[PDB]
Write a protein that binds this ligand. Structure first.
Ligand code: MG
Lengths: 50, 60, 621, 84
DNA sequence: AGTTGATCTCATATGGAGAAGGAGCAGAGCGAATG
RNA sequence: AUCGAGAGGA
DNA sequence: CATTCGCTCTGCTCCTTCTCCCATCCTCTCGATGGCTATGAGATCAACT
């Protein structure tokens, strides 16, 4: 069904997105089990500790 | 008291969830099996251990 | 040998013609729209096989698939080959479409490797003109297997493949325009999430056929997966099918189901049965006496007691905190069921047995061995069975679900000095058929030791006439397949089958699942009006030890009360009780399995009044 | 993706002039008295600077597209906005 | 040129600061149509 | 060993 | 023919939105994370002859 494949491409887009940037403004955080947020490539590069 | 309210609410929730799938199956349930005493015992223990004052699922 | 080569196929045609010239009358069976079966082939078929060929033609005209669901032994393969021969013979010119064959295009048959050469032999017997080639390491082809598929597509041969090659060669297979896909033993695609299932559904042809003796075995979901191969979209999507049929029909098999649930289930079963009926053709052996007859089967369930130490071990396990973690949802129930089912088989499988010592003299080395028969309540029964049957000169198949228990049984058979053969999934496939023929020929071998799942279909062990199923499986079709090693065409003797169970343990509940599942199957495939037996809460209470005193009924006898289910076999039972072996009770399995006006005055077809009557009767009580 | 129209190079110049001319010439009918204009009077009128493709070309388009109705009269052909 | 056997592998059962976009909207000035 | 938290030093 | 009118096209405010950043180095303790049983089929090619 077209709405299922739309939702699945939307989920693929969300995962490829949160691989690069897990600090998106309008979307949920990608998380491990126990709920901690995943560190993305951007968070690896960004800050004083990056 | 703040912690224990939420933990007792979660316990009543789980007792309802357990018993409903028996009343949906037309037969009485043992409440000694419905009460999952881990909720209070580990909720208070966890929050005192870590100092995260809330649901362990919401630690951040 | 098979026509993967070309000079073999040429030689096989030249030989067939040189034979045919020496025999140098019946008339073709005309159906309709053009289909003909050669008269010499149609005469060779039974009327039920003729009906199957006609049904296959009606499906070919509709361009629908079908499940040829006939019970094992009715000769499904002949019906398929006779139909395909008819298609090739009558040169059916496909209307209005790119498949401008004048005959049969490339066919793929997918089957277990154990039956590939049977298909080749049947084709080379019944319709020699075909070019049948096995895509397998047992196939005759010498070049790379990619080129065989091109050759068999180009010349419109018949490709025979394993399910594993379909799963692995998805592209090189599905690249081509196959005309027919036949799934033999097609219950192998019964899991909709399995990758063999997804690979089989990639075939573009509408002419998809399944051969299976069991369209369903556990769940209505298996039926969905087969119909989603056979007629995509006929049963809708799986989530919808589960909501509309699986839940309503299941929830009205319970004896504690409310009247509304019982009616809703009866309706849903009638709807499903009417939806699948055109596309599932299923004859039973009782429906057609033409294909011989079997001797009588006596199948009984023996309720054994736990030994006192086995009862302690089992009770301590159900009082354990592992079981508390299981019931509190911290653990999956699976490890606990595996443990309970071990304890029921032999406690040493759980406990490791009595503690090992070294330097003991040889006389101590019996009671202290791992798997000693006197610690298992079921082995004390098997001991008395084997002792009576060896004295009667019967021959025994001894099945267990587990191979660990099969080793404990082998150690017992050696210590009792019986002659036996053993087979299991570790027994090399090339050496299996030599063992089965040796057993059938050498009547000096008393026991064949066998896991239930080894060998697939086609293990013909009809040298035996007594069967013990040592422990129950969750899938009912496993234990019916087990007895059908002995009770099958070619059996000359009355087969007695004993199923061992331990009363008030997990084993009695596993048997209750088998019956519940078989009733669920019969409610769709036989008759939706059926009596309701099991309470749901009783069917899923798995971790409670009960064990009846000799004065008490089993739960099975309480459930099936009033059904009538409570000299060699009489003599065996007499000694199983009078010896005080620890048989609590016996039930008859076949008896348990008996679960049973201003308007409309003028026409412009079904009359409204009868369509309305059907709708009302379907929606009222 | 994977599909293309046959096109004419430079069609944008024509399409620009055509779209603006069409709206211009249709407004000449819309703005005239009664929303009526006699075709001979229109074709005699000094075309707007917006009507670069010519005024007859546009009246043939407008009539073919059914954007204006012709009415025959004793005075000759009359353009109208259609009751739509 | 033909034959064996580990081994993998599927599959089964139960704060804040700056920057950027948009809408509102005023009104300049161009060209058609008067009057 | 990692991640997180808290308490400290200049 | 001198308006006059209507219509297109800037460009000037005032939001909403959103993205970025927040001293250096060092020490210690503490909590948490922390992942079936088993039997079958069956394809591979390492490796015997
Ligand atoms: Mg078959």
């Amino acid at each position: 069904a077209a709405h299922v494949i739309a939702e699945d491409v939307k989920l693929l887009q969300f995962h490829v997105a949160t691989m690069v940037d897990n600090e998106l403004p309008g979307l949920p955080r990608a998380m491990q089990k126990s709920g901690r947020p995943l560190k993305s490539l951007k968070q690896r590069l960004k800050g004083k500790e990056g | 008291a703040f912690l224990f309210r939420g933990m007792f609410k979660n316990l009543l929730k789980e007792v309802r969830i357990y018993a409903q799938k028996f009343i949906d199956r037309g037969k009485d349930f043992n409440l000694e099996l419905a009460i999952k005493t881990r909720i209070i015992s580990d909720g208070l223990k966890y929050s005192l251990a870590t100092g995260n004052w809330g649901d362990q699922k919401k630690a951040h | 040998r098979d026509d993967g080569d070309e000079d073999y196929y040429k030689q096989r045609l030249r030989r067939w013609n040189k034979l045919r010239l020496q025999d140098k009358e019946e008339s073709d069976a005309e159906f309709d729209e053009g289909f003909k079966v050669p008269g010499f082939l149609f005469k060779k078929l039974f009327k039920y096989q003729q009906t199957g060929v006609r049904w296959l033609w009606e499906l070919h005209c509709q361009q629908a698939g079908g499940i040829l669901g006939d019970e094992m032994g009715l000769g499904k393969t002949i019906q398929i080959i006779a139909f395909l021969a008819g298609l090739s013979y009558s040169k059916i010119r496909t209307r209005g479409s790119n498949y401008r064959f004048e005959g049969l295009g490339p066919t793929v048959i997918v089957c277990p490797t154990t039956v590939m050469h049977q298909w080749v032999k049947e084709f080379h017997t019944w319709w020699p003109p075909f070019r049948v080639a096995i895509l397998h390491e047992t196939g005759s082809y010498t070049h790379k297997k990619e080129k065989l598929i091109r050759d068999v597509a180009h010349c419109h041969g018949i490709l025979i493949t394993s399910y594993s090659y379909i799963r692995l060669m998805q592209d090189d297979i599905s690249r081509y325009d196959w005309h027919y896909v036949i799934l033999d033993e097609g219950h192998k695609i019964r899991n909709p999430n399995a990758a063999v299932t997804l690979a089989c559904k990639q075939f573009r042809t509408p002419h998809r056929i399944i051969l299976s003796g069991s369209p369903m075995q556990n769940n209505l979901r298996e039926l969905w997966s087969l119909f989603d191969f056979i007629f995509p979209g006929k049963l809708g999507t799986l989530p919808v099918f589960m909501e509309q049929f699986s839940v309503p029909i299941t929830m009205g098999g319970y004896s504690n189901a409310s009247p509304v649930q019982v009616k809703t289930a009866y309706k849903c079963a009638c709807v499903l049965r009417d939806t699948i009926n055109p596309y599932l053709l299923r004859r039973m052996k009782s429906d057609v006496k033409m294909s011989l007859s079997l001797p009588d089967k006596n199948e009984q369930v023996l309720f054994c007691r736990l030994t006192d130490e086995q009862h302690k071990v089992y009770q301590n396990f159900v009082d354990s905190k592992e079981v508390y973690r299981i019931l509190n949802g911290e653990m999956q129930i699976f490890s606990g069921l595996i443990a309970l089912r071990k304890i029921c088989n032999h406690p040493d499988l759980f406990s490791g047995g009595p503690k090992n010592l070294k330097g003991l003299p040889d006389d101590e080395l019996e009671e202290d061995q791992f798997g000693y028969w006197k610690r298992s309540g079921k082995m004390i029964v098997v001991e008395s069975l084997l002792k009576i049957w060896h004295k009667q000169g019967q021959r025994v198949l001894l099945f267990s679900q587990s191979r660990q228990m099969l080793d404990i049984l082998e150690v017992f058979l050696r210590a009792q000095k019986y002659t036996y053969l053993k087979m299991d999934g570790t027994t090399t496939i090339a050496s299996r058929q030599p063992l089965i023929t040796r057993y059938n020929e050498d009547t000096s071998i008393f026991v064949f030791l066998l896991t239930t799942r080894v060998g697939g279909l086609g293990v013909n062990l009809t040298g035996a006439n007594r069967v013990v199923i040592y422990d129950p499986d969750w899938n009912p079709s496993t234990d019916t397949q087990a007895r059908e090693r002995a009770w099958r065409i070619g059996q000359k003797k009355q087969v007695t089958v004993y199923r061992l169970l331990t009363a008030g343990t997990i084993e009695e509940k596993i048997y209750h699942r088998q019956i519940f599942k078989q009733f669920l199957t019969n409610r769709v495939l036989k008759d939706p009006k059926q009596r309701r037996f099991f309470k749901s809460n009783d069917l899923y209470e798995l971790f409670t030890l009960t064990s009846p005193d000799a004065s008490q009924s089993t739960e099975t006898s309480a459930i099936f009360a009033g059904t009538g289910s409570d000299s060699n076999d009489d003599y065996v039972l007499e000694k199983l009780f009078k010896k005080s072996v620890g048989v609590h009770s016996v039930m008859k399995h076949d008896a348990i399995m008996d679960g049973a006006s201003r308007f409309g005055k003028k026409r412009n077809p079904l009359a409204s009044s009868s369509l309305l009557a059907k709708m009302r009767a379907r929606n009222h009580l | 993706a994977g599909s293309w129209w046959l096109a004419v190079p430079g069609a944008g110049r024509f399409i620009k002039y055509f779209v603006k001319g069409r709206q211009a010439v249709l407004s000449m009918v819309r703005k005239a008295k009664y929303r009526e204009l006699l075709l001979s009077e229109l074709l005699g009128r000094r075309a707007p600077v917006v009507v670069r493709l010519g005024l007859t070309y546009h009246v043939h388009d407008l009539i073919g597209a059914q954007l204006v109705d012709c009415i025959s009269t004793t005075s000759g052909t009359l353009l109208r906005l259609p009751e739509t």
